[PDB]
Design a protein around this ligand. Structure first.
Ligand SMILES: [Ca+2]
Ligand SMILES: [Ca+2]
Ligand SMILES: [Ca+2]
Ligand SMILES: [Ca+2]
Length: 206
């Protein structure tokens, strides 16, 4: 036998259903030849794909997760039931294509994820905390954007790779003691997924 091509590359959606076709291989024609995997660069690759020993059809066999692994290399052979008979080999590269299956995570940089205080004497601009928003997806699906909600005497400041929670108002512990702030976040995949974190700011005099 001889595979039509030496190397094949196929795209497959992440989260593809079990039994999704990946590729139908061919190393003969008009059969007694036996298609099999002989190697699996990652050992994870072994649960993700099955192949029909008779037709050489590879199908999805477990849950394909882009965030777990992007790209699979499989080595396939074809061998006739034969007393003496050499195998044909090919490589099958499976690109697992990322979809937006991950909402944005919103992280506060403080020593606690709500316990977060300030002094009313802090001026216009005092960075009280740092927020980091992440998304495990790639590309647009993973580009995130966020925004403080309600209106309140703070504001977020937009940097590449992080945001800073400032004061934007005269504070005094007497007029307003606690606050409840909400951060809303949205990624740029389709459909856009979105996430939000509500967290407390307690004010002090010192
Ligand atoms: Ca075939
Ligand atoms: Ca995933
Ligand atoms: Ca994804
Ligand atoms: Ca996402």
């Amino acid at each position: 036998p001889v595979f039509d091509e030496p190397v094949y590359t196929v795209n497959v959606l992440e989260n593809s259903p079990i039994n999704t076709l990946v590729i139908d291989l061919n190393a003969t024609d008009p059969g007694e030849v036996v298609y099999s995997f002989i190697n699996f660069v990652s050992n994870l690759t072994k649960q993700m794909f099955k192949i029909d020993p008779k037709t050489g059809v590879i199908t999805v066999n477990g849950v394909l997760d882009h965030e777990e692994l992007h790209i699979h290399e499989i080595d396939v052979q074809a061998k006739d039931l034969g007393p003496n008979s050499i195998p044909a080999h090919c490589k099958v590269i499976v690109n697992v294509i990322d979809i937006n299956d991950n909402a944005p995570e919103i992280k506060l940089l403080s020593e606690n994820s709500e316990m977060v205080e300030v002094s009313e004497n802090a001026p216009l601009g005092y960075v009280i905390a740092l927020v980091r928003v992440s998304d495990n997806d790639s590309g647009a699906n993973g580009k995130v954007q966020c925004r403080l909600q309600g209106n309140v005497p703070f504001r977020l400041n937009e940097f590449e790779s992080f945001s800073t929670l400032l004061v934007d108002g005269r504070l005094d512990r007497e007029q307003r003691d606690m606050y409840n702030l909400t951060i809303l976040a949205e990624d740029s995949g389709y459909p856009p997924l979105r996430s939000s974190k509500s967290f407390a700011v307690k004010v002090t005099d010192l």
